[PDB]
């Protein structure tokens, strides 16, 4: 699993 | 912001 | 902003 | 896993 | 089993 | 298991 | 300006 | 600016 948050 | 990937 | 990858 | 918060 | 609570 | 709270 | 590439 | 690549 990959995420990102900006 | 706010998330979560899983 | 927060969050998590798991 | 992978993730960026910025 | 896998959650986020946020 | 696995969770995150935020 | 924000970004993520993954 | 702010950024990720992964």
């Given at each position: 699993?990959?995420?990102?948050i900006?």
């Open positions: 699993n990959k995420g990102a900006f």
